[PDB]
Ligand binder design. Structure first.
Ligand SMILES: *[C@]1(OC[C@@H]2[C@@H](O)[C@H](O)[C@H](O)[C@H]3O[C@@H]23)O[C@H](CO[C@H]2O[C@H](CO)[C@@H](O)[C@H](O)[C@@H]2O)[C@@H](O)[C@H](O)[C@@H]1O
Length: 335
């Protein structure tokens, strides 16, 4: 469908061309959190790939560079002092994508140096036979929100570099996460803690990065089991993390989860594209396409007069937030 109207509205409402960052909300008092800015960077990249408007395309090309420059101006070039390994990995993954799109070597160095720091210092086999720690300050839990994004980042690095080290990393992370952070049936657990074990709370963004890593590992290897793993996690999402009418849930008020549909929709588009160009899971592909279209139309129907959609897609039409509002824009820029 049209993703151009939604992307331009999002930029008009939230982009700060002075700081080269998105505002956190329409009160324009604070810029977006560090990790979420990486996900809005990926949204700009997805809209760049989706649009057929050469004017908007050229604007988004410049914006891909600006989002990086604005974050580096505030946080510096070296993010390895951030205690959240997931914050570092969201940026390493965005930087890998920026290189795939542009070939600007600065984005390969940012991706590789941040990925290497996390994988080389935060992968551990002492606890639970594998997995990356959530934090580099304290080691108490290993989480879906670092492990699956790390597998995805390693798969982008393998595509760019052809260095089998990165496919090895992706495979080891994903196999460990499938074993320790899922039920084997498509449900992705939040985390596994040293004292209390697995925490089997499922969320949009952890289903999403699991599906994206499984699809990426299917594309790298040709092994149909990884695509089956992705389809099971997609089916779980469609059958559990929805309301009684099939609309994806609103996961607020938690600020990190409120915009999680953005990451889910990005990765569900990857799966849709792979099913469409392979003839895999034909009955599911048709039902998946109908359910995605239903959700995207519900989101479209929830737009305000400025073409901004808050994250409560099933609810009635205040201050708008860039992370909650990103999910509809992503949904309309599927690649
Ligand atoms: C903790 O994570 C917050 C965020 C991440 O969302 C993000 O990856 C970011 O880069 C880094 O700053 C951290 O909270 C997340 C949400 O926790 C709540 O929901 C879950 C799922 O229902 C629940 O299990 C928790 O108890 C919280 O109620 C969580 O997804 C992360 O794993 C971290 O625990």
């Amino acid at each position: 469908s049209d993703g151009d109207t939604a992307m331009k509205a999002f930029n008009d409402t939230f982009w700060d061309p002075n700081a080269k960052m998105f505002w956190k909300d329409s009160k324009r008092e604070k810029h977006q959190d560090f990790w979420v800015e990486a996900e809005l960077w990926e949204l700009v990249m997805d809209a760049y790939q989706h649009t057929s408007d050469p004017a908007l395309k050229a604007e988004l090309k410049t914006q891909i560079d600006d989002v990086y420059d604005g974050t580096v101006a505030k946080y510096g070039q070296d993010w390895t002092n951030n205690p959240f390994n997931d914050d570092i990995m969201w940026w390493a993954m965005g930087s890998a994508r920026a290189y795939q799109i542009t070939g600007n070597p600065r984005y390969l160095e940012a991706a590789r140096d941040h990925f290497d720091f996390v994988y080389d210092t935060q992968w551990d086999e002492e606890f639970a036979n594998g997995g990356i720690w959530w934090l580099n300050s304290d080691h108490n839990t290993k989480n879906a929100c670092i492990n699956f994004p790390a597998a995805q980042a390693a798969l982008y690095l393998y595509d760019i570099t052809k260095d089998e080290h990165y496919l090895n990393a992706a495979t080891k992370i994903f196999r460990w996460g499938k074993t320790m952070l899922t039920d084997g049936n498509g449900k992705v657990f939040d985390r596994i803690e040293i004292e209390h074990g697995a925490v089997p709370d499922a969320t949009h963004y952890n289903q999403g990065t699991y599906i994206g890593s499984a699809v990426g590992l299917y594309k790298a290897t040709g092994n149909a089991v990884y695509l089956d793993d992705a389809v099971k996690a997609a089916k779980f999402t469609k059958n559990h993390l929805v309301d009684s009418n099939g609309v994806l849930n609103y996961e607020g008020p938690n600020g990190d989860l409120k915009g999680g549909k953005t990451i889910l929709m990005r990765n569900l588009a990857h799966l849709q594209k792979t099913l469409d160009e392979t003839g895999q899971y034909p009955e599911f592909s048709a039902e998946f396409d109908e359910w995605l279209a239903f959700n995207i139309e519900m989101a479209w129907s929830h737009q305000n007069s400025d073409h901004i959609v808050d994250g409560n897609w099933a609810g009635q039409l205040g201050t708008y937030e860039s992370w909650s509002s990103a999910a509809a824009v992503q949904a309309l820029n599927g690649i």
